[PDB]
Amino acid sequence: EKARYFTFLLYPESIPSDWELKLETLGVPMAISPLHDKDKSSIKGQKYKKAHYHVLYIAKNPVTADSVRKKIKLLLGEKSLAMVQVVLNVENMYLYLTHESKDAIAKKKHVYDKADIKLINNFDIDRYV
Ligand SMILES: [Cl-]
Ligand SMILES: [Cl-]
Ligand SMILES: [Cl-]
Ligand SMILES: [Cl-]
Ligand SMILES: [Cl-]
Ligand SMILES: [Cl-]
Ligand SMILES: [Cl-]
Ligand SMILES: [Cl-]
Ligand SMILES: [Cl-]
Ligand SMILES: [Cl-]
Ligand SMILES: [Cl-]
Ligand SMILES: [Mn+2]
Numbered sequence: 001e002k003a004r005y006f007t008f009l010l011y012p013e014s015i016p017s018d019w020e021l022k023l024e025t026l027g028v029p030m031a032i033s034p035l036h037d038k039d040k041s042s043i044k045g046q047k048y049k050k051a052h053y054h055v056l057y058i059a060k061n062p063v064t065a066d067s068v069r070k071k072i073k074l075l076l077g078e079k080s081l082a083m084v085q086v087v088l089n090v091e092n093m094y095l096y097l098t099h100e101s102k103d104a105i106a107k108k109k110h111v112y113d114k115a116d117i118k119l120i121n122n123f124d125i126d127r128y129v
Pocket of ligand 10: 114117
């Protein structure tokens with residue numbers, strides 16, 4: 001029930017305006033997706049999912065997803081995050097940030113620009129695969 005690689009979603013309405021600088025205070029590598037403003041909705045009668053970011057988070061040692069959730073809530077506020085997911089395939093999850101994983105492309109998801117990925121704490125995907 002512990003892991004090193006995690007992902008979670010952040011939504012503009014429920015994060016502080018200085019959320020990115022606050023993540024920059026943590027001591028773990030992260031990759032932040034481009035803004036996902038054009039993802040297809042799962043809600044009957046809507047077109048777009050609520051604009052959000054995806055964060056790929058690399059713990060230093062094996063930890064629980066709950067521990068990561070509590071850490072981000074203490075940093076960004078209780079309303080900032082509902083849950084944290086474990087990542088088992090870190091390369092595919094990195095590519096998912098721009099919907100360029102094989103599964104994202106199979107599902108015809110909206111492709112984003114890799115230039116809009118933000119790396120914190122010298123994230124380098126080659127180290128984690
Ligand atoms: Cl930290
Ligand atoms: Cl962006
Ligand atoms: Cl850690
Ligand atoms: Cl951690
Ligand atoms: Cl833990
Ligand atoms: Cl995964
Ligand atoms: Cl997918
Ligand atoms: Cl999509
Ligand atoms: Cl596209
Ligand atoms: Cl890249
Ligand atoms: Cl750095
Ligand atoms: Mn998305």
